[PDB]
Amino acid sequence: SDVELRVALPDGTTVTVRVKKNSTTDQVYQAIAAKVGMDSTTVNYFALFEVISHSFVRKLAPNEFPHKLYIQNYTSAVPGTCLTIRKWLFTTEEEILLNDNDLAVTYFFHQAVDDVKKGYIKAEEKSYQLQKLYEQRKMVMYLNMLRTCEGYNEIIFPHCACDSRRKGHVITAISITHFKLHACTEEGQLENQVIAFEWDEMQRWDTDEEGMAFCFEYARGEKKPRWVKIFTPYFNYMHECFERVFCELKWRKEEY
């Protein structure tokens, strides 16, 4: 029993695949990566995401059925699908190693360009230099410079409540470097406080399905480990980021 699926790719094209009705997300992802020319190296740097809003996409958990998400959220409007292929990688050095892969470079470039437009990457200072490289279409040079800007390979979540703030909310920001909570109002306006947690201070982490919360336990300075709860709806996505960061840290090949 076969069905067609549409999926958005980082360069703005879409692709369609014929997959079995009840396929899981990784089975759909492999089929797509086959249909677009991803080889055995490149395929591990991308994954399936769902568009939530103009400023947030969420990674599909392993036991989801992409076709069910496609059908549920389908409209006539462009792109014609809620599914999208995006980069999945926190260690920007692994990116460099792909600077000779035409497929990878092209996808990295076009998504990085979109992330700059959306404010995730803060070029600002060298905006003009990056614009000239963009206009001459020197993708690798563009990426090599943007890779030094604040916000590259950071995952920003929508603001939400937290059991360890008296009032207001937090915007969670995840990167290979640390785990950052930014203080904001209950409306989402950025206040002026940020806490950085190093990954080495993370003792355990977990989800709370019933309480719609991601949970982490840290041991900072000299005190005793405390649990913090972030009441995010995307708590399984957040847990996957933790597992993935530690995995990339374990297999890191460079002192840089």
């Binding site: 937290c162 360890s164 703030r165 008296r166 909570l181 203080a183 406080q193 806490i195 913090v228």
Partner: peptide, 6 residues
């Protein structure tokens, strides 16, 4: 306590 305090 509050993270953004002490």
């Amino acid at each position: 306590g509050d993270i953004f305090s002490t």
